[PDB]
Design a binder for this molecule. Structure first.
Ligand SMILES: [Mg+2]
Ligand SMILES: [Mg+2]
Ligand SMILES: [Mg+2]
Ligand SMILES: [Mg+2]
Ligand SMILES: [Zn+2]
Ligand SMILES: [Zn+2]
Lengths: 480, 480
DNA sequence: TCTGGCCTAGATCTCA
DNA sequence: CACGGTGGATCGAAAA
DNA sequence: TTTTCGATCCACCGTGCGGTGGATCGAAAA
DNA sequence: TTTTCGATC
DNA sequence: CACGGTGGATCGAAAA
DNA sequence: TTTTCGATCCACCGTGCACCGTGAGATCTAGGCCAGA
């Protein structure tokens, strides 16, 4: 007879970020005072962690990697989700389809243990694939929806290996996942069968240009258009898209930062107005303007702009992208760009990252108007692949992945697990053997992202929704 | 009326590493389950934190720094210490002296916030001063002793500022702290006057050469001995010591790593047998042997040797050294050094870092024998300033600081506080304003290192003992 | 004509 | 030999 | 017999120094 | 040619 | 317009 | 009235890319070239 059910104790251990010693200490220090039954014995929590694991035969953990068979992971994910549904009896005998999004990214700047000289690459950086369930569709009628589709609390890991992400490992992992996705059957939970629809939209431009048939990052992966070809519009409108590439959903996170960098790189060269930095005094005018723009940003908006930092690279952050767009008048006064163009870009990014249903006709109209405005204002600086992919091909990309609103398709989820992965590799693994450390990092990822647990898990409800701009409210489609 | 005393709740908050939200979640979730009282309201803990602060007029927190007047911090430290004494009346009306060790170090590669552009140096690296009480002496008879003299749980902060530790700022803070030590009056705690004796031994060699009357790091700051002179023993024995520099006690942490690195830098160039790598083919042989030794260490002992790390310089950790001295036979066959030299160095390092009383006649004998052995073995590689300070001047700097056994005078604590400072700046500050963030980092340092709290606060004990090498135990002074 | 010794000069170590 | 940890594995005893 | 719970143990981590931009590959400018 | 610039992470 | 969070400050109402 | 205790807020963090050795300073080896045998 315990006051906390071992699963509620597991939720308390996950939300408070406690460790075996810390939980045992909590328990014993509650015992010492005179209230015996307040927490289950850690044995019970170690036993309740087991409901969340896929069977041992499906998970393959070794020194330099840890993978789970995608079919088994999805079986388990659905079996857990059905313990969240209000009344799984209520839904009638109509076929079920779980829509989820998966994708991989590389987390660098890992702490390098001195142990287990293994065989591959040591451990400096991991490259992992994540599968987050977005929605459960019963013949169109949504029965279960992920309340925070970009949160890391539902993002399931498939496999993670200590290999630096390069073109070949990316291609091989994508081929493996495609074979595993083809070869999977609908799961079965309490007589209801669930067919899985997996979209690889948690992805970033580097991996995306890897996957498509396109050689350099200078060209769009959808139109194979060379960098100077992307100025004029008609040659682009007559282009023929490569096949199945809309599956590489518009990356909403990196769009912010990269279009920010595009507007910046236009601001830096406003004194000589050319795309290349080649010439007499081009570099020098560029660098003087660069330093002045950095310092003016620092003064007024109190934020670092394009300064190198260990790990991540630049301190060109997500929140820096938010703040570069928050007040277009101020940012225009600082950089010298046109305020209406920056405002148009902020509106487009709000519409995309909103997570609300977007109307393709009005969005395409907005986007082509914005591209005309851009070419009019700054035609010399050729649009970078992300801002081009955003303006021209954004409408079609939104239209294809219409089942779930784009912006619910964000790679941010996977990026968030980086901040979680370290916190599980440093403080929650057992360091005896590398195999044990990886096995427990994977156990922690599974337990943390379990829908039944992460449903009844304390959290912070302090993010009340923000007010859109005067134009996104027309661009979006609200039902309320 | 409650079950957990607010001070014990505060201990449970500091030990479990809980935040305000996590504590409130703990409390409310325990309430919801039918236990009306198991934890005090977070208001009670916020009010119990105030016991541990020094008065507001002595703590000066600003955007770029936060300091405390030394006399007030010491008043508070003793006032707390007298709350953990077994018997406060049993100590008689006899003079009391608290012997404590203080010193500063710089922690670079901090989290670089984008905020509060205030003029100086931004915030990338802090330079902070620490004061840890070692022992309470009643006319030679100990009443209170710090059970773990290098544990960051007792290390009190004096001041911390966001500036790069450099010769000028180091000299200025040393001058200021010397003045503050001169002007301090004995504290008055419940009819007992406690006079303070502060020794600046938590210090690294770089700061130590900054402070002494010595200009270059390559010279032994005690004897101002140039690196080419440091081979001959008698000539050095003739050298007159700088004034009062014995106060800068033996740095037990860094001496270990620098001895490891001296033995290594002897191993690397074992082929051509000269100090400098200046020559024809010297660089190439040196680097080839260096790569060979690195790979052999990798294979046999599974530890990184002299390859760069991010943020902490090189991958030469304290544990890398402690493993480099675990079995001198292996490392001897690995590098090419003599086994008995490494054995002797490991023995004196156990003697120093043991934290037990040392017999300076036997230690001086052992050290001059080891110097003779080093010269007879390798005369060409001029002893590195740290290993020379360790062998020649080690007996004298031990005998001077004989009141508390050296190794209890260890800078480890200061260094260890870095790992905590980060964990408090990132996870426990309030990020609204830099001034607020520094105020809360300082409050967290104070509370975490409060002797009354950190005494009765749960802790982990698995490191009970490690057996000594035979010559070390013949060198030490055991009393138990 | 041989030969060692002074003397700039910049490349190397050392500590963090 | 710095100190505070890291979580399953496993033995052993007490329940049940 | 089977479950439950503490107690030990394994063999390592992370605070111990930073710096400036890099990797890669096509693609545009001279 | 060829020789540097840049987009992406 | 990502999401989970950071702790004192202050208000307001309830308990004493 | 004074102490308690929850609610709300403030304005930001951190996951979003790299390698490779750095920094300040005196100090030491190179070897260059001239003054007596
Ligand atoms: Mg990426
Ligand atoms: Mg230092
Ligand atoms: Mg340090
Ligand atoms: Mg990433
Ligand atoms: Zn295109
Ligand atoms: Zn000396």
């Amino acid at each position: 007879s315990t006051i906390f059910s071992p699963e509620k104790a597991l939720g308390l251990l996950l939300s408070l970020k406690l460790s075996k010693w810390q939980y045992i200490t909590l328990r014993e220090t509650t015992i010492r005072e005179g209230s015996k039954e307040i927490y289950p014995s850690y044995y019970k929590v170690q036993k309740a962690k087991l409901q969340c694991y896929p069977p041992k035969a499906f998970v393959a953990v070794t020194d330099s990697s840890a993978k789970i068979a995608l079919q088994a992971l999805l079986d388990l994910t659905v079996n857990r989700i059905f313990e969240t549904i209000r009344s799984p009896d209520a839904i009638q005998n109509k076929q079920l389809i779980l829509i989820s999004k998966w994708g991989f990214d590389g987390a660098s700047n890992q702490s390098r243990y001195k142990q287990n000289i293994e065989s591959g690459q040591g451990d400096s950086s991991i490259f992992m694939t994540s599968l987050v369930p977005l929605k459960l569709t019963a013949d169109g009628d949504t029965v279960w929806v992920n309340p925070k589709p970009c949160s890391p609390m539902y993002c399931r890991p498939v496999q993670f290996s200590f290999v630096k992400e390069t073109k070949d490992v990316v291609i091989n992992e994508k081929t493996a996942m495609d074979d595993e996705i083809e070869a999977l059957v609908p799961s079965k939970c309490q007589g209801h069968e669930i067919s899985h629809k997996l979209m690889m939209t948690m992805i970033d431009g580097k991996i995306c240009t890897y996957l498509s048939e396109a050689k350099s990052n200078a060209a769009c992966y959808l139109c194979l258009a060379k960098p100077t070809e992307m100025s004029k519009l008609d040659v682009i409108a007559s282009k023929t898209i490569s096949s199945g590439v809309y599956e590489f959903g518009l990356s909403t996170l990196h769009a912010r930062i990269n279009v920010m960098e595009c507007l910046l790189h236009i601001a830096y060269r406003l004194d000589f107005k050319k795309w290349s930095a080649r010439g007499e005094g081009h570099q020098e005018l560029l660098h003087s303007r660069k330093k002045l723009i950095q310092d003016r940003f620092k003064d007024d908006l109190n934020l670092l702009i394009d300064i190198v930092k260990q790990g991540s690279g630049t301190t060109n952050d997500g929140n820096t992208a938010r703040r570069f767009f928050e007040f277009p008048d101020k940012t225009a006064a600082i950089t010298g760009l046109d305020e209406d163009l920056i405002r148009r870009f902020s509106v487009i990014l709000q519409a995309i990252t909103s997570g609300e249903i977007i109307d393709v006709p009005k969005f395409k109209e907005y986007a082509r108007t914005t591209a005309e405005k851009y070419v009019e204002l700054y035609d010399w600086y050729y649009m970078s692949s992300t801002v081009h992919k955003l303006l021209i091909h954004g409408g079609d990309i939104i239209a294809e992945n219409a089942i779930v609103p784009i912006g619910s398709l964000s790679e941010e989820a996977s990026e968030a697990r980086n901040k979680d992965f370290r916190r599980f590799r440093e403080h929650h693994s057992r360091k005896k053997s590398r195999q044990a450390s990886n096995e427990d990092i994977l156990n922690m990822l599974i337990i943390s992202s379990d829908p039944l647990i992460s449903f009844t898990r304390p959290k912070l409800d302090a993010h009340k929704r923000q007010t859109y701009f005067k134009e996104t409210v027309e661009l979006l489609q609200l039902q309320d």
